[PDB]
Design a protein around this ligand. Sequence first.
Ligand SMILES: [Zn+2]
Ligand SMILES: [Zn+2]
Ligand SMILES: [Zn+2]
Lengths: 64, 86, 46, 114, 263
Amino acid sequence: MIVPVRCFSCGKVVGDKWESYLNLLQEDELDEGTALSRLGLKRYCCRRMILTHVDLIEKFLRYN
Amino acid sequence: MSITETFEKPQRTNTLRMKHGTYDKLDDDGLIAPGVRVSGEDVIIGKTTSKRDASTPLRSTENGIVDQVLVTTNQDGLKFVKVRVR
Amino acid sequence: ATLKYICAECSSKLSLSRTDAVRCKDCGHRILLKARTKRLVQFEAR
Amino acid sequence: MNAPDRFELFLLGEGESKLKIDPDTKAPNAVVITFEKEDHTLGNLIRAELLNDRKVLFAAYKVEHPFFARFKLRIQTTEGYDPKDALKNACNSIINKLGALKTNFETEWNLQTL
Amino acid sequence: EEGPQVKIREASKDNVDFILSNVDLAMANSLRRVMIAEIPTLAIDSVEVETNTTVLADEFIAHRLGLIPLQSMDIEQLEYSRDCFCEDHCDKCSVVLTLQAFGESESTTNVYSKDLVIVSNLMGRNIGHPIIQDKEGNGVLICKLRKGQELKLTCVAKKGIAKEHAKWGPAAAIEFEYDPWNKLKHTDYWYEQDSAKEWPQSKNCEYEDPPNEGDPFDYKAQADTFYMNVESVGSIPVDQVVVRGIDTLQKKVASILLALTQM
Ligand SMILES: [Zn+2]
Ligand SMILES: [Zn+2]
Ligand SMILES: [Zn+2]
């Protein structure tokens, strides 16, 4: 619904990386993988975390 | 013919058709209120016919947390209640 | 000073019951929401 | 539910001990110790040291079911050498070599930048 | 200083790569397991919700709170709540934190873990503080509000071990390898045409002499050297994942001596 706080598998915090990831795509124009590696998410477990999140709360917030 | 039902916390008034569970969680309208934990075979909706009991409990294998209680009328005018638990 | 009910739609603490109707005060909408206990609810964060 | 609290993996029930020591009937100078609220961490470690001891004839451990944190270690020793002594001798090595290592480490870590 | 030898190769606030040298596999794996499972740490473990008009549910939120890593350098000087003589919690067994948020702006208001206020007396033990590692110092995103929406909570943190729930774990991944060439034949390599063409060389091979094709297998060799790398989430600095790791074992073993004595 939100970025999960950690990688389910290794525990690395990853919930402090969502705004940055999305800034790193739209503002500085990197491809999704270069971006993830810049935030230091280098095992495929953590990468899967950000790369496959879906921010559904951004839809939930349109209701009144 | 006014042989009516009424949402209301019932108690033990000369017919007493009540349930193996607690009514201790309902409010004076006969309805838990969001936030409360529920459980066991807890009553969730209080109802009556003096006292022919028409009152709903939580499914036996379930437990959760009341999340919304919603009250309205039908086309035909009946008060409905809907309780969702989480 | 209190809460009891809420209006599903126009968002506004109603509070009423029996011979009262089941509608509203400043939208006329027939749907009402029960409103959160004040008994405080605790979670284990697990 | 039916789920035993997680605290049960590290913390003793009412009336349980850390060790129960029982004589083994199968062979001489043999014992079986059951360690509660422990698992492989300790069990593979004690065990492996007991084997660096040449008065150690046998040693082995197992967790019989994964749902309970308890292991069972079986030590056999040479005649005149109590098995419980072989387990002080072995717990004592361990604690020594780790001693050692937290020092070699604490050290290597000031020799350090970033 | 004879015994198990150390050899850091990299270090950073966040990781420490090293080589243990002169130890058994068992002790090396055991210290791995301890670092993952049994170093004490501090974590939200009770949450009371005064208000939440948020688009998330409470336990969803609560769960997320227990996962925000919270400073834990001084955690020996917090007693376990179950060991303390208080009724419930207090300042000897607990930090209490607060969270209030209201979507004041039109645009969407985020709630981060810096918005966490400690409300209890620390006795100047460095614990409790939300850890923050991003450039903007926001730490973790907990929630999001819309204009009109509110969230008010309290939390109690408590000392805990990852055995009990992983939120209390200080370590993240722990790299761990040995015998990069395969000289010990501890593993047998699957392949289609050639085992060496088809498997990638570990980084740890440079460090260690390739074997020579003649060399008839060495039956006596043992696994004596381990390429580790511990990574910390931040509630405890790193070097300290290791040292309290080594220290936690050493105490487990001693509780065994102590309990022989009591027989
Ligand atoms: Zn991961
Ligand atoms: Zn209205
Ligand atoms: Zn206390």
